[PDB]
Amino acid sequence: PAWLATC
Amino acid sequence: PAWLATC
Amino acid sequence: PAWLATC
Amino acid sequence: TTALVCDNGSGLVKAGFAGDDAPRAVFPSIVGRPRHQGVMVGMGQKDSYVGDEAQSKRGILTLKYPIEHGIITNWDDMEKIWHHTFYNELRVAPEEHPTLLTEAPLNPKANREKMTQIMFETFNVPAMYVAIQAVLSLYASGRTTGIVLDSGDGVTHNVPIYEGYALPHAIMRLDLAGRDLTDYLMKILTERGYSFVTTAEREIVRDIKEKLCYVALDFENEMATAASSSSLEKSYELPDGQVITIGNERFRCPETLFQPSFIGMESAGIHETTYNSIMKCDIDIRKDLYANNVMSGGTTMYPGIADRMQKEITALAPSTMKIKIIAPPERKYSVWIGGSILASLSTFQQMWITKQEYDEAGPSIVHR
Amino acid sequence: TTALVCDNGSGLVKAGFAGDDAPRAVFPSIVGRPRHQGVMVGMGQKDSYVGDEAQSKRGILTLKYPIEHGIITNWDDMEKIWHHTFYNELRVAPEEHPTLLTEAPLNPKANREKMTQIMFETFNVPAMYVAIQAVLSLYASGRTTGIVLDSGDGVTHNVPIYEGYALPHAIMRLDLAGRDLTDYLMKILTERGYSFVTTAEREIVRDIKEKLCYVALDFENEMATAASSSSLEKSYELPDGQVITIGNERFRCPETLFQPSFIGMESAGIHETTYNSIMKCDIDIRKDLYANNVMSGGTTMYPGIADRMQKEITALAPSTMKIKIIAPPERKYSVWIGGSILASLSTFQQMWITKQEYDEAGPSIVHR
Amino acid sequence: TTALVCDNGSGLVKAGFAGDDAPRAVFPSIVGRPRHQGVMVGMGQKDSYVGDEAQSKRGILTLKYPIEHGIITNWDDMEKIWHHTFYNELRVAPEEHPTLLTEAPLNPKANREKMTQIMFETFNVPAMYVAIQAVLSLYASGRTTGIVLDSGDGVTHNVPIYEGYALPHAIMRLDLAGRDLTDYLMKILTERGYSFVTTAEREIVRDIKEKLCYVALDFENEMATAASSSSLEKSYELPDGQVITIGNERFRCPETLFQPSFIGMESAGIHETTYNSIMKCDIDIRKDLYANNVMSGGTTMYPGIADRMQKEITALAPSTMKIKIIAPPERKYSVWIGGSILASLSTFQQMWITKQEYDEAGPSIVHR
Amino acid sequence: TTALVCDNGSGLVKAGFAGDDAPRAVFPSIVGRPRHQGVMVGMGQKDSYVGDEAQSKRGILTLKYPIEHGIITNWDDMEKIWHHTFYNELRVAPEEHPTLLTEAPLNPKANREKMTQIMFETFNVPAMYVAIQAVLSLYASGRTTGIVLDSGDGVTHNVPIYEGYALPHAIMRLDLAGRDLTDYLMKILTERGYSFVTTAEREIVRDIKEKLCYVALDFENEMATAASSSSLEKSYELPDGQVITIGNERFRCPETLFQPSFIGMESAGIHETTYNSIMKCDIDIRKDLYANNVMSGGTTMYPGIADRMQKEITALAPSTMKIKIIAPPERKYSVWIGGSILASLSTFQQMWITKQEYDEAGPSIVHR
Amino acid sequence: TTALVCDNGSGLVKAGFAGDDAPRAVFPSIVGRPRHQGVMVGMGQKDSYVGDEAQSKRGILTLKYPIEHGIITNWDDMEKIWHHTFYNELRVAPEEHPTLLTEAPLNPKANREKMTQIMFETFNVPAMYVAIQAVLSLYASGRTTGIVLDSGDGVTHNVPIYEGYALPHAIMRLDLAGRDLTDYLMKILTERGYSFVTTAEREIVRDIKEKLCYVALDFENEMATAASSSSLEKSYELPDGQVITIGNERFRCPETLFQPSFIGMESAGIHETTYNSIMKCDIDIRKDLYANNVMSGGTTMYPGIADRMQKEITALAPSTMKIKIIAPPERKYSVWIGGSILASLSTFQQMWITKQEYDEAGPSIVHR
Ligand SMILES: Nc1ncnc2c1ncn2[C@@H]1O[C@H](COP(=O)(O)OP(=O)(O)O)[C@@H](O)[C@H]1O
Ligand SMILES: Nc1ncnc2c1ncn2[C@@H]1O[C@H](COP(=O)(O)OP(=O)(O)O)[C@@H](O)[C@H]1O
Ligand SMILES: Nc1ncnc2c1ncn2[C@@H]1O[C@H](COP(=O)(O)OP(=O)(O)O)[C@@H](O)[C@H]1O
Ligand SMILES: Nc1ncnc2c1ncn2[C@@H]1O[C@H](COP(=O)(O)OP(=O)(O)O)[C@@H](O)[C@H]1O
Ligand SMILES: Nc1ncnc2c1ncn2[C@@H]1O[C@H](COP(=O)(O)OP(=O)(O)O)[C@@H](O)[C@H]1O
Ligand SMILES: [Mg+2]
Ligand SMILES: [Mg+2]
Ligand SMILES: [Mg+2]
Ligand SMILES: [Mg+2]
Ligand SMILES: [Mg+2]
Secondary structure, three states, X not given: XXXXXXX | OOXXXXX | OOOOXXX | OOOEEEEEOOOEEEEEEOOOOOOOEEEXXXXXXXXXXXXXXXXXXXXXXXXXXXXXXXXXXXXXXXXXXXEEOOHHHHHHHHHHHHHHHHOOOHHHXXXXXXXXXXXXXXXXXXXXXXXXXXXXXXXXXXXXXXHHHHHHHOOOOEEEEEEOOOOEEEEEEEOOEEOHHHOEEXXXXXXXXXXXXXXXXXXXXXXXXXXXXXXXXXXXXHHHOOOOOXXXXXXXXXXXXXXXXXXXXXOOOOEEEEOOHHHHOXXXXXXXXXXXXXXXXXXXXXXXXXXXXXXXOHHHHHHOEEEEOHHHHOOXXXXXXXXXXXXXXXXXXXXXXXOOOOHHHHHHHHHHHHHHOOOOOOOOEEHHHHHHHOHHHHHO | OOOEEEEEOOOEEEEEEOOOOOOOEEEEOOEEEXXXXXXXXXXXXXXXXXXXXXXXXXXXXXXXXXXXXXXXXXXXXXXXXXXXXXXXXXXXXXXXXXXXXXXXXXXXXHHHHHHHHHHHHOOOOOEEEEEEHHHHHHHHOOOOOEEEEEEOOOOEEEEEEEOOEEOHHHOEEEOOOHHHHHHHHHHHHHHHOOOOOOHHHHHHHHHHHHHHOOOOOOHHHHHHHHHHOOOOOEEEEOOOOOEEEEOOHHHXXXXXXXXXXXXXXXXXXXXXXXXXXXXXOXXXXXXXXXXXXXXXXXXXHOOOHHHHHHHHHHHHOOOOOOOOEEOOOOHHHHHHHHHHHHHHOOHHHHHOEEHHHHHHHOHHHHHO | OOOEEEEEOOOEEEEEEOXXXXXXXXXXXXXXXXXXXXXXXXXXXXXXXXXXXXXXOHHHEEEEOOEEOOEEOOHHHHHHHHHHHHHHHOOOOHHHOOEEEEEOOOOOHHHHHXXXXXXXXXXXXOEEEEEEHHHHHHHHHOOOOEEEEEEOOOOEEEEEEEXXXXXXXXXEEEOOOHHHHHHHHHHHHHOOOOOOOOHHHHHHHHHHXXXXXXXXXXXXXXXXXXXXXXXXXXXXXXXXXXXXXXXOHHHHOHHHHOOHHHHOOOOOOHHHHHHHHHHOOOOOOHHHHHOOEEEEOHHHHOOOHHHHHHHHHHHHOOOOOOOOEEOOOOHHHHHHHHHHHHHHOHHHOOOOEEHXXXXXXXXXXXXX | OOOEEEEEOOOEEEEEEOOOOOOOEEEEOOEEEEOOEEOOOOOOOOOOEEOHHHHHOOOOEEEEOOEEOOEEOOHHHXXXXXXXXXXXXXXXXXXXXXXXXXXXXXXXXXXXXXXXHHHHHOOOOOEEEEEEHHHHHHHXXXXXXXXXXXXXXXXXXXXXXEOOEEOHHHOEEEOOOHHHHHHHHHHHHHOOOOOOOOHHHHHHHHHHHHHHOOOOOOHHHHHHHHHXXXXXXXXXXXXXXXXXXXXXXXXXXXXXXXXXXXHOOOOOOHHHHHHHHHHOOOOOOHHHHHOOEEXXXXXXXXXXXXXXXXXHHHHHOOOOOOOOEEOOOOHHHHHHHHHHHHHHOHHHOOOOXXXXXXXXXXXXXXXX | OOOEEEEEOOOEEEEEEOOOOOOOEEEEOOEEEEOOOEOOOOOOOOOOXXXXXXXXXXXXEEEEOOEEOOEEOOHHHHHHHHHHHHHHHHOOOHHXXXXXXXXXXXXXHHHHHHHHHHHHHXXXXXXXXXXXXXXXXXXXXXXXXXXXXXXXXXXXXEXXXXXXXXXXXXXXXXXXXXXXXXXXXXXXXXXXXXXXXXXXXXXXXXXXHHHHOOOOOOHXXXXXXXXXXXXXXEEEEOOOOOEEEEOOHHHHHHHOOOOHHHHOOOOOOHHHHHHHHHHHOOOOOHHHHHOOEEEEOHHHHOXXXXXXXXXXXXXXXXXXXXXXXXXXXXXXXXXXXXXXXXXXXXXXXXXXXXXXXXXXXOHHHHHO
């Protein structure tokens, strides 16, 4: 979340 | 509503 | 780490 | 001219001038849009509110943070926040002051690149610099050796520094911070019948956390005490006059820092993270790191956090070594204080990135 | 030219010119038809009467209200009343005055569509607007935050507004108003032996209600006092000179606003409806709403209504909340006063519906 | 002996015996009380009515739901409902059968405790268990992996399950279900000229919803179509013989599930909630969750709901993901069917909470 | 009977029968245990998973390697892994076959002693033997002279051998292998925007490494080419359908083998280590060692590894020396193939440690 | 003025003034340079450290010895060592004092030539001399006859001397000294599970050797005793507080001096080397050499070294020969003590190489 891939 | 505080 | 003293 | 220090945290903006002992402007990093439709024509109603004004009007707004986990996700909102802090809060012309910004370690490169691009192109700042928050936390403490545990609203990280040399291979980072604790507190308050679902009620829950939560020295002993007596229960008054009582939720919320499994993460607690960071370092500097465990950031403000961390590390580390945790009273503003100190040193006045340098070497200059 | 503002309530027409301090024409909205055979050629008898003249000749007329519960049920009569309002009361030419009309919330859309169709295609007004009565009532109070309790002759409704933003999901409507109280008073007056059955006698009963009724602070104690004494009895003189005396009916009639079960409705009272409307809103704005209970409409003119509402709301709402009920002496004309204010604002002049765009888009424009 | 399965939802009570294929008794969770004065002494007036008795006598009764948003708010009425279920509907001795109950996730703790206490001390059941409804839906669907979107009368929730392991950190819940849609339809129908204000009329509106409402695949195009043609209109006959025509209100009502802003909630639609719940799970889990979207509960019975959900999820999720939605024709009773399957399993017989355990541990046992 | 050959390295377990061409069982050395709460009864939920089963269910499991840097750290997990290998993969009776194990050079003695004890007592094997992996690599290569460079998942070591005689004083060991490269890649992907923190996500990064990484023949020119163009970028699809693009990180990961300072290690690269090992040998031997550099293990499977090693060694070694690096297409299984060859030789049958010898002389027999 | 005596050993630098009983400056011959990036501007980030300051900060430094096997390999660092010695430890002006240096026998000529050139051209010392270390040790012993056995950190050599006449044809030299023993101890500590790799950890292993190692009188008996009882085990605490246990490694490491095959050397032990050197001399000299077997250097400080040497030489030498191993208590500084004695003699004042002689004859004058 709020990254680009994971999270 | 129907809860205890909010709603 | 996995060792006993260092690393 | 005096430089500008702007600690763009993920939960609060802390801005000021280099040399001052505390930031002039401190307001939540919030942007709110009206969600209902206006009916009155004679008002000066505007389409967006920022900072404190958004908190005051939160009832009719959808609040949303532009920064999450130290990464900027909305750049228009972030530009609005920066415009607010420069003009309405500090009341300065950015083109007259060099600006010192901050970031967490292990962040995406594009984040710094776009931050520099906005600072130079939009605000026409003469020069700027982007520092690492944990490093500034050490300046704030005056020492030059220690392992800094910085825990803000979005990101927690460790940075071991020895004699002014950083050990980047030992830097650790968790995406578990005050935001996740607020969400978990929202989740567990339902067990008592209180329901907070809106974004404006997330702020109420954040206030409840800030005012009533604390860290237990021994989690199971407190759990037993809570079930045995109401001595731990406290009451909080909501904005509409309702009074809500919370018991073991007071210390279950911050316990998530030491047991991230409470929120589904398999990461290690902050104590294990700092111990592992120390053990990533050379055997000859561990004794100094153990004795200079520095804390900074808002989420390190829970009562009993220092004692719990000391007990945990003392359990993890071998005996015959003095575990000592430095928890200054000004932990909340330590990063900004350090940035203020750094921006004033005469030795630093050659580390600024000048507009002349930037507009010829490209945005990649910021990674120097 | 000046803009006309007239709110066609279920019971009264209040018309005038925007900018004035009070409506110029105020007459009941009734149309009377003769119900007997004419036996004099030289009387120059008229086929129908409207407004004050109908009220004067009520003896030989059958009186009909074209508006019921804020819904126009007879359009020929409503058009007749509008024609009266324009060409006999105000004595204007509608083609050169833009007219501002009002209606209750949660009304049928066809009502507004046909209203605007008549306004444009029959009277050929240059432009017109239709406003919600509660918003105008709040305008007249000179504030932008508050929950308005409008109670006219046909409809009682609550409309929460916070900083100019309406919360339409919290709007409450209740089809219980002055006319229902008049009918109930007609019913209970039979217990004393007075029989009012004709439409003409309903006007006498309405006058009795307006001049003798009040709201009991505590219903049970007042009932006991009336039973145990004659101190509360008053007397009234009918047009024919006969005298009647009214006992506990003085406060039993308006008590229906707080106990609608007296007339068979299972809806909640106005106090409980207001409380429910407030609790439909966001938690953060309830504190401001509690302190800005604005009253308007004819049926809010019963003595002691404000105190009774304050007592009931304080009983319902939690402690620590400042509950203040604003009841201006000019409550009866709050909607018209607000409409006068709104129509005179310069910023409002962009919100008219000109006949050109009405022709371009048709009556469906009014809902935009 | 044979075990009892009772699905005490907010709208209906579905009770029966474990091992049967369908619930034996299905009646509304209603308790009615007379609101007028009896004038015929000889008749059996009766002080209160339950279930279908109240529904058939709704003309003279005021109907009240003891459950609201999955939380029991009136315990006397709920005891009355359970007594009806056990004795008049199933005609069993509750002390001779163990009972399996259900409740929504993230409910207040006291709800289970009071439920268990009433079941053990009032009905004297030998043993009982309280399950999560979304889990029983998978048993009914006969699979071990999937994300269940259960939406009944009071509460909508998502629960991801993988290989029989629940991810409680990813469980979502909305307080927006069939009852809110019924209220919105009541409000929306006013604009067409129909007024439904009493509790007995809420049931007529609920019947209209069940009969005529559907989910539009493309909301804006559907709105455009209905405004240009009457092909979408349907007619409904009220109990007294009046016929009402309903137009675009047919699909504007269930659209609230995807745009909760219609009723003033700022939460996300059910599609967004499901997608967010999926994104809360580990990256290796998401492939299987996308392919096993299981729907259950009454409000998932709108025609076109499955297609709309698939379209929205496909829009949100990345391409190359095989998004599939399972919508059994018996979605309404999936929770009860799963409870029946579970209660009959031999491996489950160790999980019953016998009254001995309740006596020696109290209500707290139910949270283990 | 035929003998077993089990090359239980840090990353993978390769097991089979002596004399067979390739290993029969090849599964990761992983033990996973559930990290979530189970909610569905029975359905074959095991308390732990091993090998390929753990990989399939890695979404709900926390994965742990029992071997780190060639040293067994959890003997319960290692007993579990061996039980799996013998009974579920090979499906053989351990007591019917003598087993050949392998170990890295310069390992703790207690490791080998405990391994022997477990093999003789827990599995009741008739006879066993422990071999140095680099020696078996030469058997697989089919030559008796050469310097082996074995790089697995945990350790990288060099073992010079000349005419069948080892040179223990010239053996070099380097605790830097595939796992460290995986961790570095995990760290390095964050600067591009992707976060991989869980144990299961660490398996995705390993797959990205095994598929997209390669060794650059000239690091600086490769970095310049990557910076000035996108021709080097590749895309990889995650299990949830998200697509990531990886650029110069493709060759920066394996570059750590030649510049251990990238991960904070002070050691020298593999080329420097091999050259130093060769220089530790006698002057008359070095010519034959330069021409027989045998590479082995999985970590030597990067494209361009052989060319880079040859270039670096030629740079370090004097001219007129024929530097030649032998890289068979099946380096991954070279250790197992050599073990297969060794166990089949007739001259080796006297080297087995029979259980009689073990129990009559204690574990120390394994050091002979 | 008084002369300077500087014993530039491979491991330690011992400097002082002629005539003093003990050297004034004794610090390790080590030069460290940072191996991480400095992040704090205010810190005094010196680019290199020498001697004691390098030991203190060894956690962040990479340590390099400029002298290996008595040969200077890095002149730019040897210059730093000498600059430190003169200007920070002794704190004298080198041009005001003649300097006496030391070298091992059979060293390269270029070593001495470069040493003289650096002394005369950079420090511009007035006059200097280079002496063989064994002769100085004999001077310190206060005798004119004997066979010296000097073993330091880099070299072990024998020098027979009879009545002041050196027998250069009998000189012996082994490139096996304290550093090789430290490396071997690092190697064998791996057997117990301790891993020391970095140059900084080599200093920890050197300290372990200096504190816990001793020479066994009979190696095999000591090994048997160690393998049967724990009485020979000791504990040592590392800088980070973790404690290691060392057993038979205590006497296996020094045993390499008598069995160089332990480290792969074909050479003979020190006892055999000294016996061969004695046998190289004339038959009439051997009787005195047997009785004047002097020992000097740090590596001869192991307890039990003298007894083992005497036992071995008695085993080698014929009976009826009296063998003495003269081991003063100050062997560490015998070379420097002798240099101080020699430098202060009046007869030696003609042996200095003056600056004018160097200028006129060139660097070759030093071989006089
Ligand atoms: N007294 C307090 N006790 C506990 N938590 C606090 C307290 N004050 C602030 N916090 C938490 O710290 C967070 C902000 O910390 P800070 O580091 O100052 O901002 P940022 O995270 O933006 O850098 C908030 O989200 C809040 O939840
Ligand atoms: N002094 C009064 N006391 C009580 N009720 C009054 C009084 N004056 C008027 N009313 C009631 O108010 C009603 C008219 O209310 P108003 O809002 O002025 O017009 P409308 O309701 O048509 O918009 C009348 O039907 C009458 O019964
Ligand atoms: N065929 C249908 N179409 C649309 N809505 C329906 C249909 N049947 C039931 N519903 C709605 O579903 C609700 C009941 O769902 P259900 O899950 O069975 O009740 P609960 O779970 O609350 O016991 C009712 O309130 C009704 O409005
Ligand atoms: N095709 C490949 N390219 C690059 N690296 C690989 C490849 N295949 C395997 N590896 C690496 O090799 C390691 C395993 O090496 P191997 O020697 O076969 O097993 P072990 O380390 O157990 O002996 C894995 O951790 C993996 O990172
Ligand atoms: N007490 C001791 N016991 C054993 N070895 C020692 C002791 N003290 C010093 N040493 C060894 O002696 C070496 C240095 O000896 P010395 O001759 O004084 O210096 P150099 O070798 O430079 O001339 C060191 O490497 C150290 O390992
Ligand atoms: Mg911060
Ligand atoms: Mg009115
Ligand atoms: Mg249900
Ligand atoms: Mg291997
Ligand atoms: Mg020496």
